[PDB]
Each structure stands twice: as structure tokens, then as C-alpha cells.
């Protein structure tokens, strides 16, 4: 049903996202348990990690488009990624290594993310009707890898330790590279321009040098979040000013500002919602016992099942507004479960968390998936970079919002933690509901501006 290179890109992307979500699923628990961070420290450190993971994407798009070529940069990204996972496994012997290992993952991610997508676009004649189908199968590829990693990584880490989980992340990347190399021949005539000239060693060294510098800068920022704050503040004012110098820019700007709120909410899944599942939810569903950290897999689960249904099924600004309302309902549901449907011992049914992740995933499908493809088309390299930047700033903010649910290490009673999660989720739901209302109010105006 698809070109032969499509399956290749599908499985490369699957295994890379597997490696990334293996870390994401266990990283906050790892900070707290393995490194002895407080919950506040782990949450803000995770926010800075995620911020760098997503604000660097633009570097990798540039390196693929203009310096080394899409396919070369896929290979180099997968190698830096694999090295980062094995360094993280090695952090258990050498704890001082931890922040360098994470910086290496972030930079590797910055290099890799833009390029398989970029490659896949070039697998199809420009108006091939399969394209939309292809890119939905791309999102599902991402979400299958995510679904497997978020499911298994916590179990693995519990039974075999973190070093093994992180080495298996590395190995996921190794086999991503193996399947790329084995199928190299399928993308012979596919690539960006530097893919078809011999490789410039000048530029390759500039890219390596700049990568290593960035690894050290990321490690520093992750260790000193209190200045990552100022750095991303100065950058945001700077990027916005250049954007204004360059009215359909206003439309992308407002939809980006609303996306930021979405990303604050998405950043709770590995942090506050993770610890809410650990602390105040029954760890048994349909009669099976589970690792509560595996609950994060409910987000890719719901995307994998919903995205076929929601491909077959106003326009853009309404779509963003709907997404905002669903996210609001997800947090309002979480608060309600805590306020009214908990046990005498302070625990809630995992079915409430299933419903929370359903709402949050539908929000995701209406904003972050749809938003990328069509906001870009409506607007170009600069706007993707600024979107990635506002996403990074959103993730830092998300870590700081997560800090309000943080639980001291000595509390053992769920009836003490439930009201903290319930107050914070309720307030997040109510602010996101207001945000969705103002969004709706601006839908007609902004939809005139699209004309």
C-alpha cells in the first residue's frame, strides 16, 4: 500500500522512539530513587532535559538540509543517540556521568528528529494521495515504539536494574541503524542535496565540534536549571522580535502560544501524573498487577487506537480549541477522581487514570499532530525553530508546574498526598478550560485571518 522505503522509515523511527521513551518513562523515578533527588529536583531537571530534547530539533533540520544530507544525518544522529543511551547505562558505575549522558541524548535527538520525517516526504510524488495515510502511519510508528517502551522499561528496570534498561535503549538504536543500513538501497535516489555529493569533511567536523560543545552546554543547563530559565527567557524575547520583523504570522503566533499551554500539560505525564499513579492509584487493573510507572503507556495506547478512527473522521482553529477542551477535561477528571471517588485509604480506580489519558491523547491528536503539519503549510524554517523553542520553554514551565505536586520522601499516607494532586489538577483543569474558552472566542476572528 506504500512505497518500499516507507516501511524502512517506519521501523527506523519505531526503534528510535523506543529508545527515547525507555528513558522518558523511567527518568523521574531514576532521579529520585537512584540519584536521591527530591521530587521537586527531579521534576525541574526532567523539564530542562525535555526542553533541550525538543528545542534543539532545528539544528538537526539544518544539518540534514544543508550540511551533510538527510540520510547521513540520520546515521550520525542514531550513532550519537546510541552512545548517549550506553553512557546512561554507564552512569550507574560513574554517577558523575549522568548529566553528560543526558546531554548526549538531547543533542543526538536534536540531530535525528527532523530527518526521517523529512526523508519520508521524499518517498512520494508530490501529490500522491497516499501521503496523508503515510504520515498517519508515521505517528502510529512513533506511538508503537512509545507504547512498547513505556510498557516494558519500568518492568525491566525493576527486575534487572537501570543499566540494563538503558543498554536496551542503546540496542534499540543499534537495530534502528542496522535496519537503516540493510535497506540503504531503498532510498538511493531519495535525499536532500548534500546526500548526493560526496561528504564534506570540513562540515562534518564543524558538526561534530558543535555537537560536543552542545553536549557540555546541555549538561551544564540541566545541572543549573535556575539559569536555563534566564537563557530561555532571553531567547524567547529575541526569537519573537525577529518573528515580528518578518497578518497570517499573527495566526501562527497565537496558535503557537496556545500550543505552549498544551505542552505544559503534556509535560505532566512523566512527572506529576506519573507520581499520582504511584501514590494514589490501585496498581491492579482487570485483575492484573502492574508497575504504576507503566501507566504512562496509556498515552501512546490511546493514540494508536484513536488515530485510525480520527483519520477517517471549524477547521484548524476550532481543532486547536477542541484539543484544549479535551486536555481540560483530562485534568478535571483527575481532580474529580481524587475529590469524590477515592477509597477510605486514599486510592482511586485506575479506570479514572485510563479516562484521563484518553482525554489527554485526544487533545494531543487535535493539537500537536495536526498542528505541526498544517500550521507550517499555512505559514518557514524560522517558524519551525520558533515552534520548537516555544515547546522547549513550555517543557521547562511544565517541570515547574509539576513541582506543586511534589511529595517529601517521608510521607507514607495517601490521604496526605491525594488533596495536593487534587488541588493542583483541579486548578490546571480550570485554567486550561478558561484558555479553551478564549481560544473559542477567537476562532471566528482568526478564521477570517486565514482568508
Amino acid at each position, epitope marked *: 500500500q506504500q512505497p518500499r522505503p516507507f516501511f524502512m522509515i517506519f521501523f527506523v523511527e519505531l526503534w528510535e522512539r523506543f529508545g527515547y521513551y525507555g528513558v522518558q518513562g523511567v527518568l523521574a523515578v531514576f532521579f*529520585v*530513587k537512584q540519584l536521591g533527588f527530591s521530587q521537586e529536583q527531579a521534576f525541574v531537571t526532567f523539564g530542562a532535559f525535555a526542553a533541550l530534547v525538543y528545542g534543539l530539533i532545528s539544528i538537526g533540520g539544518y544539518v540534514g538540509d544543508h550540511l551533510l544530507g538527510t540520510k547521513r544525518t540520520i546515521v550520525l544522529g542514531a550513532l550519537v543517540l546510541a552512545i548517549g543511551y550506553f553512557m546512561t547505562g554507564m552512569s550507574l558505575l560513574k554517577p558523575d556521568l549522568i548529566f553528560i549522558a543526558l546531554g548526549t541524548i538531547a543533542v543526538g535527538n536534536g540531530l535525528f528528529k527532523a530527518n526521517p520525517a523529512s526523508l519520508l516526504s521524499k518517498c512520494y510524488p508530490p501529490k500522491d494521495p497516499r501521503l496523508d495515510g503515510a504520515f498517519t502511519l508515521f505517528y502510529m510508528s512513533i506511538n508503537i515504539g512509545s507504547l512498547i517502551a513505556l510498557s516494558l522499561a519500568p518492568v525491566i528496570a525493576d*527486575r534487572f536494574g537501570y543499566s540494563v534498561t538503558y543498554n536496551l535503549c542503546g540496542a534499540g538504536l543499534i537495530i534502528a541503524l542496522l535496519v537503516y543500513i540493510a535497506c540503504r538501497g531503498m532510498v538511493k535516489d531519495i535525499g536532500s542535496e548534500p546526500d548526493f555529493r560526496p561528504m564534506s569533511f570540513s562540515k562534518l567536523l564543524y558538526v561534530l565540534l558543535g555537537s560536543v560543545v552542545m553536549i557540555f552546554v546541555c549538561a551544564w543547563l540541566m545541572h543549573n536549571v535556575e539559569v536555563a530559565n534566564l537563557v530561555l527567557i532571553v531567547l524567547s524575547i529575541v526569537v519573537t522580535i525577529i518573528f515580528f520583523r518578518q497578518n497570517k504570522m499573527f495566526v501562527a503566533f497565537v496558535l503557537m502560544l496556545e500550543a505552549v499551554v498544551f505542552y505544559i500539560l503534556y509535560a505532566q505525564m512523566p512527572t506529576s501524573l506519573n507520581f499520582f499513579a504511584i501514590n494514589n492509584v490501585h*496498581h491492579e487493573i482487570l485483575g492484573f498487577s502492574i508497575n504504576p510507572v507503566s501507566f504512562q503507556a496509556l498515552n501512546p495506547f490511546w493514540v494508536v487506537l484513536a488515530s485510525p478512527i480520527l483519520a477517517g473522521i471549524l477547521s484548524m482553529p476550532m481543532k486547536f480549541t477542541l484539543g484544549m477542551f479535551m486536555c481540560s477535561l483530562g485534568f478535571l477528571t483527575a481532580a474529580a477522581a481524587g475529590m469524590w471517588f477515592a477509597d477510605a*485509604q486514599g486510592l482511586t480506580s485506575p479506570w479514572f487514570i485510563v479516562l484521563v489519558y484518553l482525554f489527554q491523547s485526544l487533545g494531543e491528536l487535535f493539537i500537536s499532530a495536526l498542528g505541526l503539519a498544517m500550521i507550517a503549510a499555512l505559514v518557514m524554517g524560522f517558524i519551525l525553530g520558533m515552534w520548537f523553542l516555544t515547546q522547549a520553554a513550555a517543557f521547562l514551565l511544565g517541570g515547574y508546574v509539576a513541582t506543586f505536586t511534589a511529595v517529601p520522601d517521608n510521607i507514607t*499516607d495517601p490521604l496526605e498526598t491525594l488533596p495536593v494532586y487534587t488541588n493542583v489538577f483541579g486548578k490546571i483543569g480550570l485554567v486550561t478550560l478558561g484558555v479553551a474558552v478564549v481560544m473559542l472566542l477567537m476562532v471566528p476572528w482568526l478564521k477570517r485571518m486565514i482568508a
Partner: nanobody
Framework: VQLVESGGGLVQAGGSLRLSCAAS????????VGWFRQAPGKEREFVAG???????RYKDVVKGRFTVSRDNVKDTVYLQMNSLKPEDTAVYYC?????????????????WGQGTQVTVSS
């Protein structure tokens, strides 16, 4: 995933016993371990526990007599019971729940030992 309790037995009023809970597969380090006890014709009740980061919870009637502790190297959890009284007589079970909480009821815990009998004689 499966816990084993040891150390029970028979002791005279005001003496001491030491239960130990050990796990097999997973590292017990990620788990709050709660000790429950069932006396003849009564419900399982929470006695004492330690979470995954050294926070402690106790039933009122055992404070200042029982101590829960954890050897994270041997991956083992202990219940030292001093000043044992006849009404401490029960089957004692250890239970494991992932994370930092010690809920008071048995439904909060998925992993369970078989139990060891503790008898305190007047």
C-alpha cells in the same frame, strides 16, 4: 513479586522477635513494605512499614515497641518486635507496594508473603 516471611515463633510476654521479609525476582528497593497481622477471628490490620525512601508508618498500639527497618544491600526488610504482649499473637504477613505509600488496607498491596505465626505467652 513473591515475598517470603521468616522469623516467627513462640515467645514469652515482654520478650522480642525479629521478622524478615525477602523478595525473589524484583529488587525490593522500589517497594514500600507493610507488615500486616491477623489474629484469631479478626481482619488483617496494618502493623508497620517502610516506604521506598525510609519513611515509616506504624499502627498506634505498636509504637515504641516495634521497629521496621531496611537493609538495602541484602534487599531485606525487618520487623523488630520488643516488649511483646499476648495480644500481639497473630499470623504476620509482609506486603509490597511499588513506590512511597503505605496504605492501611490489604487491597493497597499486590505482593504478599505466606505468613509466619507469632505467639506471645503470658
Amino acid at each position: 513479586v513473591q515475598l517470603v516471611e521468616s522469623g516467627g515463633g513462640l515467645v514469652q510476654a515482654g520478650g522480642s522477635l525479629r521478622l524478615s521479609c525477602a523478595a525473589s525476582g524484583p529488587t525490593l528497593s522500589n517497594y514500600a513494605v507493610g507488615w500486616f497481622r491477623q489474629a484469631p477471628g479478626k481482619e488483617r490490620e496494618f502493623v508497620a512499614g517502610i516506604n521506598w525512601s525510609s519513611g515509616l508508618r506504624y499502627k498506634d498500639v505498636v509504637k515504641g515497641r516495634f521497629t521496621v527497618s531496611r537493609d538495602n544491600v541484602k534487599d531485606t526488610v525487618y520487623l523488630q518486635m520488643n516488649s511483646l504482649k499476648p495480644e500481639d499473637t497473630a499470623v504476620y504477613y509482609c506486603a509490597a507496594r511499588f513506590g512511597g505509600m503505605l496504605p492501611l488496607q490489604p487491597s493497597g498491596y499486590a505482593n504478599w508473603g505466606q505468613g509466619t505465626q507469632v505467639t506471645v505467652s503470658s
